[PDB]
């Protein structure tokens, strides 16, 4: 347990042979939703995406039930390819912006979300059908806004209470918004609940809802591969290594290792001591 144990790292992660994507100030979901600081990540691929502990959200605060599920789904696919679809939201106001989601010194919003408000103080029951006539699995990212006072629920949507229903052939999703003032993040007490819905080839996405809704602008392509995600603060260097740890790249010569349990690629097995 001495000569045959790899106990050191080079201090940095090799960008070869694996396609490495660095997060910088962005998380995977901040780049997924369309955080203005994360617009550079749109439609990029990766074999291993490294989130930094320095990452932060600089848009309009958002929460995600099953946050380790959605993060590991997008990570296992290894792509952010997004295709805009033409959802016909007739009777509403689109492209809603916020003062805490700034890009190019203007009020903006998530680039992959269409925050819908009333129109002419109308807001009818929106039933939008969207088929999946492809051969590959689609991923739709939608949201549910949580206004703080129904003073805003009336001002934004002109209904005392909303409700969101997302149905497919296999799945059905029902979410009711929660009116409530909350701790101000970037001077905002309101929140938005982000959910996800997968549709398979031949399946149809159904939206059976009035709109306290954060409508999607399209779908993400879903691939199946060895892609993954890792939390690390080690720099990225120009080198080649078939093993990556959050402490840096290590050689896979030894049959064992005590660098870190979290590994990626063809790596030795982890030992508890020495």
């Amino acid at each position, epitope marked *: 347990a001495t000569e045959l144990v790899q106990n050191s790292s080079i201090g940095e992660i090799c960008d070869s042979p694996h396609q490495i994507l660095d997060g910088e100030n962005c998380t995977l979901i901040d780049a997924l939703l369309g955080d203005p600081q994360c617009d550079g990540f749109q439609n990029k691929k990766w074999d291993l995406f490294v989130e930094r*502990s*320095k990452a*932060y959200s600089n848009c309009y605060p*958002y929460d995600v039930p099953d946050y380790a599920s959605l993060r590991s789904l997008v990570a296992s696919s290894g792509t952010l390819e997004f295709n805009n679809e033409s959802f016909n939201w007739n009777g509403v106001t689109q492209n809603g912006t916020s003062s805490a989601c700034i890009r190019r010194s203007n009020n903006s919003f998530f680039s992959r979300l269409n925050w819908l408000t009333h129109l002419n103080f109308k807001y009818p029951a929106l039933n939008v059908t969207m088929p999946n006539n492809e051969q590959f699995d689609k991923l739709y990212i939608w949201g549910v806004h949580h206004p703080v006072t129904d003073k805003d629920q009336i001002f934004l949507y002109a209904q005392p209470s909303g409700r969101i229903t997302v149905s497919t052939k296999r799945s059905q999703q029902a979410v009711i918004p*929660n009116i409530g003032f909350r*701790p*101000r993040i970037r001077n905002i007490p309101s*929140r938005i609940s982000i959910y996800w819905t997968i549709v398979k080839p031949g399946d149809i996405l159904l939206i059976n809802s009035t709109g306290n809704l954060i409508a999607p602008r399209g779908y993400f392509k879903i691939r199946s591969g060895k892609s993954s995600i890792m939390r690390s603060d080690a720099p990225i260097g120009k080198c080649k290594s078939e093993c990556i740890t959050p402490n840096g790249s290590i050689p896979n010569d030894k049959p064992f290792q005590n660098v870190n349990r979290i590994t990626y690629g063809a790596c030795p097995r982890y030992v508890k001591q020495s």
Partner: antibody
Amino acid sequence: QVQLQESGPGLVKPSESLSLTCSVSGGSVSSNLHYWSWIRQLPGKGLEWIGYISYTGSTKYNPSLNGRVTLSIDASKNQFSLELSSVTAADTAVYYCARDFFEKLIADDLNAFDIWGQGTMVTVSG
Amino acid sequence: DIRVTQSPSSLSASVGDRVTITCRASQSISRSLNWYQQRPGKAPKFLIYAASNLQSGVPSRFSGGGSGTDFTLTISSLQPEDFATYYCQETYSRTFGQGTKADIKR
């Protein structure tokens, strides 16, 4: 706004069960996502969290106090009470009742103590 | 079991000085803590949320930062009305800090 006023005795003889009641005004005590808590003040120790309860009733308590704490909510009166059994001289303090929201969205943190009550002194000199 | 350490216990600074209070933890708590203010004879006040989000009654001179274990509360230009006792609470612990009350350099 949502006001909170603690009511109860200012003197409690030792070995007795301390009892205080917080009254919530301007809002519904029943809340879908909310906890109601109690916290005590001593000069030299600062603040010390005590208990915390949901509308359904869900409790966890400070392990420093060995289960001597028992809170309770009555939605018919918009009130929630504190009951501390077997009080000693180390239990004289200032007790506050506070409206708290919990969020845990990605950070898994988010125990927020929003509104705080005026306060009531209690003494154990007896 | 979570440990909290707040430093210093007390200090002194002039009007307009830049003072920093440190709240250290034994275990990593991510970007997760909050800072409060209780003035004498008053209940505490909800100042900062999630280590760096200022709240309703902030005068903009207050600020916080930090990640992991070492968090900092900073007052850019210390004002007289800032005289109070400051606490840091860690959530999953539900433990209050020891407290730091400082006063204006007289």
